[PDB]
């Protein structure tokens, strides 16, 4: 059972089997010094298989990987970009971001942030013109927090870049949000091709707006009640895409990014890498009938 830092040092040193699902992306990966093997040729089931990094670009392959979880018997994480933007531009950006960052530095902030959620009942997020409060319940649901990677467990890399609390069982099974959050940009995640066809165009509009000025999201009783992007109120567009669907405005994720990205971020690119941006991000939607939006505030400071 390999240690997480042991895993990523090998990733930095190109000592991992790079499993790839779209071979048209092979040249960009091999140009970065990795030996690539197609997805359908790597035996995740064999226990002696070498420690692997899987890049899933396609939703059908994202499903094939999920089919192999209970059968997996070795060491593997995977960067799942199938549910975000899967263009070469997004893929090159995601890999450049991952391969440039300081992993050990990221994992300790992550460890420290979990040392903060467990102890405290209240968190205050201060952004330039806003303050957000988070009241953790007595029973919080969290994303996998293993620091030594277990055998047969398919780790999503992203969960190594953030400390994430989520309201999965019910609307407020873990935490409640009241107040405002001024954020930098956003990403959005869709689990189905049906949803991605409907919302992607709109969500990309919202992302580009986020570059044009003040971004602010407001919560009352853990329900999103206002969404300002580029200094303009878009709450009407928010309601059209959440009303009458799933839990509507219920916040679904409260998480803390732990990555000091050395390379410039691009907030027009819907890549999961941006969710790990050092700071705070809030989640709305489950990616089923509403895209799971993540309003990400970078330089945000925390208060207990
Ligand atoms: Zn998150
Ligand atoms: Zn999220």
Coordinates of C-alpha atoms and ligand atoms in Angstrom, one line a residue:
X1 CA 0.0 0.0 0.0
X2 CA 2.0 2.9 -1.4
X3 CA 2.2 6.3 0.2
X4 CA 0.6 9.2 -1.7
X5 CA 3.8 11.2 -1.8
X6 CA 5.6 8.1 -3.0
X7 CA 3.1 7.9 -5.8
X8 CA 3.4 11.5 -7.0
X9 CA 7.2 11.6 -6.8
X10 CA 7.1 8.8 -9.4
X11 CA 4.6 10.8 -11.4
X12 CA 7.0 13.8 -11.3
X13 CA 9.8 11.4 -12.4
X14 CA 7.9 9.6 -15.1
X15 CA 8.1 6.3 -13.3
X16 CA 4.4 5.4 -13.7
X17 CA 2.5 3.4 -16.3
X18 CA 0.5 6.1 -18.1
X19 CA -2.9 4.6 -19.2
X20 CA -4.6 6.6 -21.9
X21 CA -8.1 6.2 -23.4
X22 CA -7.8 8.5 -26.5
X23 CA -4.7 7.6 -28.4
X24 CA -5.0 10.8 -30.5
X25 CA -3.7 12.4 -27.3
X26 CA -0.7 10.1 -27.1
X27 CA 1.8 12.5 -28.8
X28 CA 1.2 15.2 -26.2
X29 CA 1.7 12.8 -23.3
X30 CA 4.8 11.1 -24.8
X31 CA 6.2 14.6 -25.6
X32 CA 6.1 15.1 -21.8
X33 CA 8.3 12.1 -21.1
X34 CA 5.7 9.4 -20.3
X35 CA 5.5 5.9 -21.8
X36 CA 1.9 5.5 -22.8
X37 CA -0.2 2.4 -22.9
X38 CA -3.8 2.2 -24.3
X39 CA -6.6 1.7 -21.7
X40 CA -7.8 -1.6 -23.2
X41 CA -4.3 -3.1 -23.0
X42 CA -3.5 -2.4 -19.3
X43 CA -4.6 -5.1 -16.9
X44 CA -5.9 -3.2 -13.9
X45 CA -7.0 -6.6 -12.5
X46 CA -3.6 -8.3 -12.2
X47 CA -2.0 -7.6 -8.8
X48 CA 1.6 -7.4 -10.1
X49 CA 0.6 -4.6 -12.6
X50 CA 2.9 -1.6 -12.2
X51 CA 1.6 1.5 -10.5
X52 CA -0.5 3.4 -13.0
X53 CA -1.9 6.8 -13.8
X54 CA -5.1 6.7 -16.0
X55 CA -6.2 9.7 -18.0
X56 CA -9.8 9.3 -18.9
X57 CA -11.0 11.7 -21.6
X58 CA -14.2 10.0 -22.7
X59 CA -17.3 9.3 -20.8
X60 CA -17.6 5.7 -22.1
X61 CA -14.1 5.0 -20.8
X62 CA -15.0 6.7 -17.5
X63 CA -17.6 4.0 -17.3
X64 CA -15.2 1.2 -18.2
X65 CA -13.0 2.3 -15.4
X66 CA -15.9 2.3 -12.9
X67 CA -16.7 -1.2 -14.1
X68 CA -13.2 -2.2 -12.9
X69 CA -13.2 -0.9 -9.4
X70 CA -14.2 -4.0 -7.5
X71 CA -11.8 -6.0 -9.8
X72 CA -8.9 -3.6 -9.4
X73 CA -6.0 -5.1 -7.4
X74 CA -3.1 -2.7 -7.5
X75 CA -2.0 1.0 -7.3
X76 CA -3.8 3.5 -9.5
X77 CA -5.2 7.1 -9.3
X78 CA -6.8 8.8 -12.3
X79 CA -7.5 12.3 -13.6
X80 CA -11.1 12.2 -14.8
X81 CA -11.7 14.9 -17.4
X82 CA -14.5 13.2 -19.2
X83 CA -17.2 15.1 -17.3
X84 CA -15.5 18.5 -17.9
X85 CA -14.1 20.0 -21.1
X86 CA -12.3 17.2 -23.0
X87 CA -10.6 19.2 -25.8
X88 CA -6.9 19.0 -26.4
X89 CA -6.6 22.6 -25.1
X90 CA -8.2 21.5 -21.8
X91 CA -6.2 18.2 -21.7
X92 CA -2.9 20.0 -22.3
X93 CA -3.8 22.5 -19.6
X94 CA -4.8 19.9 -17.1
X95 CA -1.6 17.9 -17.5
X96 CA 0.7 21.0 -17.5
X97 CA -1.0 22.1 -14.3
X98 CA -0.7 18.7 -12.6
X99 CA 2.9 18.0 -13.6
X100 CA 4.2 21.5 -12.5
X101 CA 2.9 21.6 -8.9
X102 CA 4.3 20.8 -5.5
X103 CA 2.5 17.6 -4.3
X104 CA 4.0 17.3 -0.8
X105 CA 3.2 20.9 -0.2
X106 CA -0.4 20.3 -1.4
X107 CA -1.0 17.1 0.7
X108 CA 0.0 18.8 4.0
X109 CA -2.4 21.7 3.5
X110 CA -5.0 19.1 2.7
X111 CA -4.1 17.2 5.9
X112 CA -4.2 20.4 7.9
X113 CA -7.6 21.4 6.5
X114 CA -9.1 18.1 7.6
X115 CA -7.5 18.8 11.0
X116 CA -9.7 22.0 10.9
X117 CA -13.0 20.6 9.8
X118 CA -13.1 17.8 12.4
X119 CA -12.4 20.2 15.3
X120 CA -14.4 23.2 14.5
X121 CA -18.2 23.9 14.3
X122 CA -17.9 27.2 12.4
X123 CA -15.9 28.5 9.5
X124 CA -15.9 32.1 8.1
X125 CA -14.7 32.7 4.6
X126 CA -13.6 36.3 4.0
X127 CA -13.4 37.6 0.4
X128 CA -13.0 41.2 -0.7
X129 CA -16.5 42.4 -0.1
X130 CA -18.2 39.3 1.4
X131 CA -18.2 37.0 4.3
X132 CA -19.5 33.4 4.3
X133 CA -20.3 31.2 7.2
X134 CA -20.3 27.4 7.3
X135 CA -21.9 25.5 10.2
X136 CA -20.7 21.9 10.2
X137 CA -23.1 19.3 11.6
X138 CA -22.1 16.7 14.1
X139 CA -21.9 14.1 11.3
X140 CA -20.1 15.3 8.2
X141 CA -19.5 13.4 5.0
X142 CA -16.1 13.8 3.5
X143 CA -14.2 12.8 0.4
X144 CA -11.7 9.9 0.7
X145 CA -8.8 11.1 2.9
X146 CA -6.3 8.2 2.6
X147 CA -2.7 9.3 2.8
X148 CA -1.3 5.8 2.0
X149 CA -2.9 4.6 -1.2
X150 CA -4.7 1.3 -0.7
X151 CA -4.6 -1.7 -3.0
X152 CA -7.5 -2.0 -5.5
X153 CA -8.9 1.5 -4.7
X154 CA -9.3 3.7 -7.7
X155 CA -8.2 7.1 -6.4
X156 CA -9.5 10.2 -8.2
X157 CA -6.4 12.5 -8.2
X158 CA -8.6 15.5 -7.6
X159 CA -9.4 14.3 -4.1
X160 CA -5.7 14.6 -3.4
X161 CA -5.9 18.4 -4.2
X162 CA -8.7 19.4 -1.8
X163 CA -10.4 18.9 1.5
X164 CA -14.0 18.4 0.6
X165 CA -17.1 18.2 2.8
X166 CA -20.4 17.3 1.0
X167 CA -24.1 17.1 1.7
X168 CA -24.8 13.7 0.1
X169 CA -27.4 12.0 2.2
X170 CA -29.6 15.1 2.5
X171 CA -29.7 18.8 1.8
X172 CA -27.8 19.7 5.0
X173 CA -26.5 16.4 6.3
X174 CA -23.1 17.9 6.9
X175 CA -23.1 21.7 6.8
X176 CA -25.1 24.8 6.1
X177 CA -24.1 28.0 4.3
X178 CA -25.3 31.5 5.1
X179 CA -23.7 34.6 3.5
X180 CA -21.8 35.7 0.4
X181 CA -18.8 34.4 -1.4
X182 CA -16.8 36.6 -3.9
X183 CA -14.9 34.1 -6.1
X184 CA -12.4 34.0 -9.0
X185 CA -13.9 31.6 -11.5
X186 CA -16.0 28.5 -11.9
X187 CA -16.0 25.0 -13.3
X188 CA -19.0 22.7 -13.9
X189 CA -19.3 18.9 -14.0
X190 CA -21.8 16.8 -15.9
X191 CA -22.1 13.1 -15.3
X192 CA -24.3 12.4 -18.4
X193 CA -24.1 13.4 -22.1
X194 CA -27.7 14.5 -21.9
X195 CA -27.0 17.2 -19.4
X196 CA -23.7 18.3 -21.0
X197 CA -25.5 18.9 -24.3
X198 CA -28.1 21.2 -22.6
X199 CA -26.0 23.2 -20.2
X200 CA -22.5 23.4 -21.5
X201 CA -23.1 26.4 -23.8
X202 CA -24.8 28.3 -21.0
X203 CA -22.2 27.4 -18.4
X204 CA -19.4 28.5 -20.7
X205 CA -21.1 31.9 -21.0
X206 CA -21.0 32.1 -17.2
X207 CA -17.4 31.2 -17.1
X208 CA -16.4 33.9 -19.6
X209 CA -18.5 36.4 -17.7
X210 CA -16.4 35.6 -14.6
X211 CA -13.4 37.3 -16.2
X212 CA -15.3 40.6 -16.7
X213 CA -15.5 41.8 -13.1
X214 CA -17.0 41.1 -9.7
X215 CA -18.2 37.6 -9.1
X216 CA -20.4 36.9 -6.0
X217 CA -22.7 34.1 -4.9
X218 CA -25.1 34.4 -2.0
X219 CA -26.5 31.7 0.2
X220 CA -29.5 31.8 2.6
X221 CA -30.1 28.6 4.6
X222 CA -27.6 26.8 2.4
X223 CA -29.7 27.7 -0.6
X224 CA -28.1 29.8 -3.4
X225 CA -30.2 32.9 -3.8
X226 CA -28.0 35.2 -6.1
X227 CA -25.2 34.7 -8.6
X228 CA -23.3 37.8 -9.9
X229 CA -20.8 37.3 -12.7
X230 CA -18.7 40.1 -14.3
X231 CA -20.5 42.6 -12.2
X232 CA -23.9 41.6 -13.5
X233 CA -26.7 39.7 -11.7
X234 CA -27.4 36.4 -13.5
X235 CA -29.8 34.9 -10.9
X236 CA -32.4 34.5 -13.6
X237 CA -30.1 32.2 -15.6
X238 CA -29.3 30.4 -12.4
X239 CA -32.9 29.7 -11.6
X240 CA -33.7 28.4 -15.1
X241 CA -31.0 25.7 -14.7
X242 CA -31.7 24.7 -11.1
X243 CA -35.4 25.3 -10.5
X244 CA -37.6 22.1 -10.4
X245 CA -34.5 19.9 -10.6
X246 CA -32.6 17.8 -8.0
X247 CA -32.3 19.9 -4.7
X248 CA -32.3 23.1 -6.7
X249 CA -30.2 25.7 -4.9
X250 CA -29.0 23.4 -2.1
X251 CA -25.2 23.7 -1.7
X252 CA -23.8 20.2 -2.4
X253 CA -20.1 20.7 -1.6
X254 CA -18.0 22.9 0.7
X255 CA -14.3 22.3 0.0
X256 CA -10.9 23.9 0.4
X257 CA -8.3 23.8 -2.4
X258 CA -4.7 23.1 -1.4
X259 CA -2.7 23.8 -4.5
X260 CA -0.4 26.7 -5.2
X261 CA -0.3 26.4 -9.0
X262 CA 3.0 27.8 -10.2
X263 CA 1.7 28.3 -13.8
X264 CA -1.0 30.8 -14.8
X265 CA -4.6 29.6 -14.4
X266 CA -7.0 29.9 -17.2
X267 CA -10.6 30.4 -16.0
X268 CA -12.1 30.0 -19.4
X269 CA -11.0 26.3 -19.4
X270 CA -13.5 23.9 -17.6
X271 CA -10.8 21.7 -16.1
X272 CA -11.1 19.9 -12.8
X273 CA -7.5 21.1 -11.9
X274 CA -9.0 24.6 -11.1
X275 CA -11.1 23.1 -8.3
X276 CA -7.9 22.5 -6.4
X277 CA -7.0 26.2 -6.6
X278 CA -5.7 27.3 -3.2
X279 CA -8.6 28.8 -1.3
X280 CA -12.3 28.0 -1.0
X281 CA -15.0 26.8 -3.5
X282 CA -18.7 26.0 -3.0
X283 CA -20.7 23.5 -4.9
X284 CA -24.2 23.6 -6.3
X285 CA -25.9 20.8 -8.2
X286 CA -25.1 17.1 -8.5
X287 CA -24.2 16.9 -12.2
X288 CA -27.3 14.9 -13.0
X289 CA -30.0 17.4 -14.0
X290 CA -27.9 20.4 -12.8
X291 CA -24.2 20.8 -13.7
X292 CA -22.2 20.6 -10.4
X293 CA -21.0 24.2 -10.3
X294 CA -17.9 25.1 -8.3
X295 CA -17.5 28.8 -7.5
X296 CA -13.8 29.0 -6.7
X297 CA -12.4 31.8 -4.5
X298 CA -8.6 31.6 -4.6
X299 CA -6.9 34.0 -2.1
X300 CA -9.7 33.5 0.4
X301 CA -8.8 33.4 4.1
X302 CA -10.4 31.1 6.7
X303 CA -11.6 32.0 10.2
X304 CA -12.6 29.6 13.0
Ligands
LIG1 ZN1 -14.3 20.4 -4.4
LIG2 ZN1 -17.6 20.9 -6.7

